Point group: C4
Chain length 476, copies 4
Amino acid sequence: LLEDQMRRKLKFFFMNPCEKFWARGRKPWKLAIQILKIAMVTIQLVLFGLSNQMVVAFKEENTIAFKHLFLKGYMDRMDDTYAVYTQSDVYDQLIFAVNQYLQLYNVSVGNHAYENAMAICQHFYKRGNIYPGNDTFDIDPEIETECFFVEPDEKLNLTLDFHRLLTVELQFKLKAINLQTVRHQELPDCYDFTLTITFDNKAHSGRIKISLDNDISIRECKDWHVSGSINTHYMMIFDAFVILTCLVSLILCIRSVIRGLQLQQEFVNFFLLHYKKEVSVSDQMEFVNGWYIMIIISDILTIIGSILKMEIQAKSLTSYDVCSILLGTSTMLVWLGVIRYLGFFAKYNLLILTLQAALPNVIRFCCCAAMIYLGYCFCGWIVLGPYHDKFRSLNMVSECLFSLINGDDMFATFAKMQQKSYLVWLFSRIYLYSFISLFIYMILSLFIALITDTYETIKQYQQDGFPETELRTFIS
Amino acid sequence: LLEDQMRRKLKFFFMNPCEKFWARGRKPWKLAIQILKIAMVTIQLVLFGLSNQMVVAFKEENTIAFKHLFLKGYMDRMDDTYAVYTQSDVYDQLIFAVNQYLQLYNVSVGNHAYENAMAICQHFYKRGNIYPGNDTFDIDPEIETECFFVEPDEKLNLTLDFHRLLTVELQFKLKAINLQTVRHQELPDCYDFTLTITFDNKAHSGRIKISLDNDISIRECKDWHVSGSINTHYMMIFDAFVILTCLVSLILCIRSVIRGLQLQQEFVNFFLLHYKKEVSVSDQMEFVNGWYIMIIISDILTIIGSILKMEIQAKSLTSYDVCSILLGTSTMLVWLGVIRYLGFFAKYNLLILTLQAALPNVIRFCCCAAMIYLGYCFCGWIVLGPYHDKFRSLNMVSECLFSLINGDDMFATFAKMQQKSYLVWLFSRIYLYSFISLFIYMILSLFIALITDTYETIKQYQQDGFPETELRTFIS
Amino acid sequence: LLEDQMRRKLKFFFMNPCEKFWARGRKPWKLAIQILKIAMVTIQLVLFGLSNQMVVAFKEENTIAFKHLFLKGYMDRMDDTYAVYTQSDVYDQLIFAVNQYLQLYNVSVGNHAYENAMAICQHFYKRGNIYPGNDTFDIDPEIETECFFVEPDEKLNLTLDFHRLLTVELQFKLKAINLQTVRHQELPDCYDFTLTITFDNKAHSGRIKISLDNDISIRECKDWHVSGSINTHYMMIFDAFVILTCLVSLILCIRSVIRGLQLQQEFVNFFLLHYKKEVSVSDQMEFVNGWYIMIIISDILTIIGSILKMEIQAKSLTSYDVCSILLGTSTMLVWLGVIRYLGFFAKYNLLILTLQAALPNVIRFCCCAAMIYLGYCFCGWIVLGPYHDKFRSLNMVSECLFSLINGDDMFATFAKMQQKSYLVWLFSRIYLYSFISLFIYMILSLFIALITDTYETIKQYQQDGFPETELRTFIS
Amino acid sequence: LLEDQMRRKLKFFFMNPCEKFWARGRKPWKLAIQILKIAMVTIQLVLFGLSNQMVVAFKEENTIAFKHLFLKGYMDRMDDTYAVYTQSDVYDQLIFAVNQYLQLYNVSVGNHAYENAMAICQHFYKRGNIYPGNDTFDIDPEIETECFFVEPDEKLNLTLDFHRLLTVELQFKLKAINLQTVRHQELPDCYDFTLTITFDNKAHSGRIKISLDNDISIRECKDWHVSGSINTHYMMIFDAFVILTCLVSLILCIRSVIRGLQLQQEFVNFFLLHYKKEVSVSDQMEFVNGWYIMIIISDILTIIGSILKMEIQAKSLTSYDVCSILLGTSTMLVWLGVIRYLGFFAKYNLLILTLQAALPNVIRFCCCAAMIYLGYCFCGWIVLGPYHDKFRSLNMVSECLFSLINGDDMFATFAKMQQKSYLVWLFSRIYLYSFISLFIYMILSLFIALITDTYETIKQYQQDGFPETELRTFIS
């Protein structure tokens, strides 16, 4: 009858394990190709990560070197967020960095070279006058910028006036070859570094903020002869094969989803002819697999990210920002679908189901508590904002005070209070104590309670019955 | 009959959602105006916070500058809680700070200026004699204070004798204009800094404690001409409109509360004529909304805080202490009432109800455990007080050892024990180990147990019935 | 009958609240005097703590001063666990400390004085010969000690040979008066400091370990004249009244306990004549109050500690070690009995009862897990002991790795591995990962489960019935 | 009948406590010898640990000394992972270390001696040419190594060219005797230190990485005469007796296991003749003791580790790596079997049983969550890898981010983001926030729920019945 032929069709359709689709008929495809995509996208990613980590592992190191070469009185180990005050000493930095640039072949150990050359930038106001003692100023909302050009060879001349001075900057390129990357592996060895020292006077507070910033561009050498004999990049293959596995599993997943929707509306109609039951929300949403939706999102994202990787490796742009993010979130989604395949196995399916049933209420409670904690933020930002250093901008309030829910670096935040106004000090202790109490002895225990109860209910389900369903009646 | 006309009245009165008051009749007021107050009080606050954060962001920076200008041998990065020992070196600080004051136009990068000028304070005893080798002293409970006045222009003379010397102090004003605040935004640019270096000899221990303290006052410039053409503060509006929204929602909430109380005592009397039941505590407290009480507290507090903000911005006092606290706690209460509006929505009402039912027992247990932990405090303060540095005053004992319940910076407090008396060392390990065990493996699990059980009981309630109530009988 | 007259007697005896003993008859004694003892022993303790904290607050400060005076190249802020290597530099420390001693009236700011004077100690072997290049030595298990005496007034001579040198030491007394203690409060102002610099060569490793140690003795000044007119210690009273309140509550508690035991064996016999039931363990232990046992322990301990305080304050010894411990643990026990008084109140009695029922199983599980964790200790001590710095002696293994259960300073212990032998590195990661997993995802959840279940069972008890008891039958 | 004679046999076989095997018949062996093995293997281990800790306690100290002697500008306290930049300064290190080697008898306090002598290593390329400015290089995959030999006695000559220079190295031996070890205890006093300074130029980045590494070999002195009269190692005994106790308990445990297996298959057959039930998996695995399996593993491992200890102490090799690991994991297994003996006692058996029933599901969930967290790792490694310092290699990602589940050093990882690309910054906050939320408010609560429920189920079992078993029927 039409009824049992459904029972055959939808029971075998809905049988969770493709192990059962294996156990009648002969087909093993949909899991095999998807494990292929797992190992493919993860080897893709890991390979990407090691290459990019070599580029970075050279960049941070050279930036360290340049910091100790061009920054006067920079301790051989390190310093951080450097600062200057007296004017002649700013002059001594600038003169020092210049004389270090010109003599760098004598000075430096590293092989960095001029490229076949410096330059100097000053940004000053169109019209300065400021009389801080007379209570009278005029301000210009315009900056005129003047430059020099100082040559690699052939003591200095220069001019500076602080009051009109907004920022001073040094820009130039040092070009260096990375032995250990090209030598063993096939990656480009040529680096164009743009070094910029910059002095921020924008605060006009007396602090001249010094930073040495490093921009980096990759190039391949015109002639490389190693071992006395005559790089070759094969990634050109495996990126492509990734894009193909991804196109394929995308097509298949989408096809199965659409078939499931056609059988969705078909089933609705059939149940209308016979029993005239509707229930299109619950059962319509049952017919959605919901995991193949993840596999589609992941799969689109690996297509886009693999394409961007292929184009950036083609032009050698080296931003590697958007590409990396896409590739990483996609592979994380794949590794999350492995839980899917663990659902069939035997026992894990309980524990997975209860993670699945807890998440939709968990997010709800996250809304509720988000209002509390978002409330404290606007409190302590304004009350403690002038006094505490870790409450400064709202963001630091939120990310610090969230680190304080998890109970980390807490004695710090208690210990660093200014204690000038005694009232704000006391408030600080009521604020911090009360809040930490509220999150650690309520809200954490509310997640524990919520999830515990969810877990026992799905344990009862797997022990005795499941909620009555039109579909379940009619398949059995 | 009088009975059903109640059932109509009190059922519609008590219907939790104003969504239902919407669904019969036509009125949407009480929620609309209150969301207005939400966005109003939070934009009020956030705006306040960004302005005040600009003032502070300039203050801390200039204080850094002055610290590195007037403190001899203050490392360009920073030092902390500075100290001096040899007497000639105290002289070298003082002479140094003076010669740095007089030459500061040559020296400093910042634009700070004398105001159209120094002064020097010495606080010495009326009669000193102390013979620490003879075992004999006489002490004076009186301080005579002598000052100098040193001019901005035109090497030094001065006198100091340590034994009679209680504190030395330098006070003076540097006046500076903040470009980046006035320039983009409408806020005052003029700062009067009172710099005070102070040397605390009060301990008479040999340590001369140096600090450089910064007092700051805001003023508007007499003539500001920017861009070659001719600040204006609009906050004058939005503060007022806040005070109005607050007055309005205050009046409305109070009115509804009072009506609810009149229907309270009315209902009591009516149930006396008919069935003669009393139960005035349970049901009398039912008639209290209890959320509008929060909205009143919040609303009064935003009235007071907005008024203080308006007056301080009027006179430009800049304490911004009491005002900020009021405004922040008020807005935190508003953000806490958003949970109220989340109670109607659908499912959250469970989870909210169980937070509500857990809090009243949670506070009880907080009493009980507060006695334990308050007991340990008086223990470790005296036993470990001489030895540990973080147990010093009782307060540090309580705030450290509370940071130790949450399990932070613990290996520190174990590792820093003096270990001179071996008995106190051993006690230290029994103390710390035992206490940390007791709070993390009992009391945290007691909050978890308490709240879990509360949550399951209100889950049963929402599943099957609620406690029998006179009101509930008579509305249904 | 004999039966109901028991029911009268034992029901009123066992009625938990003395509120009920109040509600029939007229007596309020046993709680009133005990609250007296609460406030008495805690004011006793707190007063002790503030005085002792003044003594310490001066000691640590002066020790800081001396450290910066007598230790060459000791940064004005601080250094820690100082060290020396080259021999001429050890000489430069010693010569420096001497020339700093002799000139200290010129040098130092603090008022410390010679007392109406130095001395120098050298500890050398009876017979040294060590030939580390010849592989041959002879060792003497005897030390001969030679001293000098260097005068406060009137460049140096001295002799040192490192190989025979075990330790060098400088001992002497500086005598100083503390203004701020005597002046406001009644405490002695005279301090005898014994300063000892010591150089530990015991390791014979090339590191000469320098430390400056401070011994301190309190004395009262012979003539103190303050304000031009003519300390007085009243503690002589309040210590005594403490000892009296303690004797009194001790006598009363013991008396009630003994009466309870006489009615214990009486009841056993009476139930033998009538029903011939034994059950002497359960009910015999019921007749023990069990809280008055705490009050006795506390009370004895406050007697001993108050006596030791009175004697030490009499002789002014200032060890303040054993005394402090006794006084502090006693007062902690009192503050723990306040939970007792919270048991009667109303609702807390549930939560208290479940703490009481959980503790006896909690200790059991503590045994079980103590075997695991004590096992890991003997593992990581030997495997990681040479490599990690925080696993050194077993104790540091146990107190660090316990800090690691609570999840603190963890990334440190992962990050500091030597990584010389790769096998020990890998083992280190299996060790740390596995252990941290085991305690945080098992044993903490086992305490949570144990206590939760205990709490629900006593909740059922207070809801419906208690275990059948001979006593409970026969009182009702 | 054959049936009751089983019931006698298997009931007494399976009676958990050997207390019951005591209570009929007379034998106490199997527990007595095993407690012997407990105290034996733990005294073995602890003794090992104290000896090895003396060796290490001398090694780290001397390494400190040498670091401060041979490293120019190494602060007397310490520095870490030292670095150099300018070429003449590398020369100044090298010249300095040489002049410190030659003069070390004058210089150093420690007794270290030349052994009856330096050497110097340079590793340079076979053919260098690198033109970083011309974009052209040739690389040699070959290193030619040249050495000098510099004498202990009798300013320097040397040659260095950086571009061909891969590493420079100094190797030599200082020989020192440890007084405090031989003197009190019987251990060898002679140390051969191999000191190697090494300069890593491999990065060719401009950073010359300096390290001072210490290799150490133990020897016994040819002539030691102490106290004027004439070491002796007894460990030769107790190691052997350990190996014997271990052989014995191994033989016994294995014998009982094999007997249990023979009665296993016997019982299967007997139940086949009578009732013809199979159930060989459940009951076959019941007949395995499962604890004696642990005791065998432990016992084999103590045999191997004691043997390796005996051989290393024989030859005095001092690696002490594999040996230590074996000995430590074995003794940890023994200390874990003490839980076994706690199972019989009385009440602990519940709590033990539930640890035992929770572990097999716990590992399952560990698989599931391992997929998630292993997914995040491959995400944040690539996205945050260039920017964060603690995400560098994948391993640091995993061990840091695991330290972040437990909630430690979190505000660090939030605070150190580069913030160059704003998109990667934002992603960083979604990554970190989301992940920390997911593990602390889900997966920890899922372990809590899982274990709680397991605990209540075994509580019901011990209260009422156990699952029906063929064996249990037929023993009762």
